[PDB]
Amino acid sequence: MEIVEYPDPILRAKNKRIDIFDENLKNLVDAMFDVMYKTDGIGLSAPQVGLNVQLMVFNPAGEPGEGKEIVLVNPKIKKYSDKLVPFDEGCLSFPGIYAEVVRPQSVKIDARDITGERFSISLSRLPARIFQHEYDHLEGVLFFDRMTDQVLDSIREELEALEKKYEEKTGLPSPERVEAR
Ligand SMILES: CC(C)(C)OC(=O)N[C@@H](Cc1ccccc1)CN(O)C=O
Ligand SMILES: [Zn+2]
Ligand SMILES: [Zn+2]
Ligand SMILES: [Zn+2]
Ligand SMILES: [Zn+2]
Ligand SMILES: [Zn+2]
Ligand SMILES: [Zn+2]
Ligand SMILES: [Zn+2]
Ligand SMILES: [Zn+2]
């Protein structure tokens, strides 16, 4: 497996609804949880492991044998709190890059579980922060999209280094450039 890095177009592509709730889905969910634990995460979205589907694995405790393993298939955020909070946010798709992002403090979510059954969940604090970050991934939205112009300016060169790395690895032009903003 791999974590897909910016500016790989997989991180922007449309993520497809999941219709099939079978053993293959269970196997993918297992693999994703295990990447999440390997990388000390609280949540992981399918596009970040190269699969453009509406799937997130999540454990609010973010540690083995703690919290709960929540599978969110086709999730939708139904409500965002009016209250906003800043947080020094990171992203595995942008290795070593951290910057301030302002987001709602809490959210309410509708999703389907591993069997396709509807459920809802409310999150606050760090779990809500991580969820929103990963939910953005499911909508092809990356964390610098959420930064102020001033904060973005502070990481532009780091993003350009990633753009160059992609061009060197693939022989293709970077499909997006932070310059465009
Ligand atoms: C920032 C605007 C476009 C006003 O609304 C959103 O993108 N809302 C976000 C929640 C949010 C994130 C960060 C700061 C403030 C609110 C929800 N959203 O993507 C709606 O399309
Ligand atoms: Zn691998
Ligand atoms: Zn496993
Ligand atoms: Zn596991
Ligand atoms: Zn940890
Ligand atoms: Zn992630
Ligand atoms: Zn991320
Ligand atoms: Zn939006
Ligand atoms: Zn430039």
Residue numbers in the entry: 1 to 181
What did the study's authors say about this model?
Here, we explore the precise structural inhibitory mechanism of actinonin, which is a slow, tight-binding inhibitor of peptide deformylase (PDF), a metal cation-dependent enzyme. PDF is the first enzyme in the N-terminal methionine excision pathway, an essential and ubiquitous process that contributes to the diversity of N-terminal amino acids. The function of the active-site metal is to activate the reactive water molecule involved in peptide hydrolysis. Actinonin is a natural product with antibiotic activity that inhibits PDF by mimicking the structure of its natural substrates (nascent peptide chains starting with Fo-Met-Aaa, where Fo is a formyl group and Aaa is any amino acid) in their transition state.
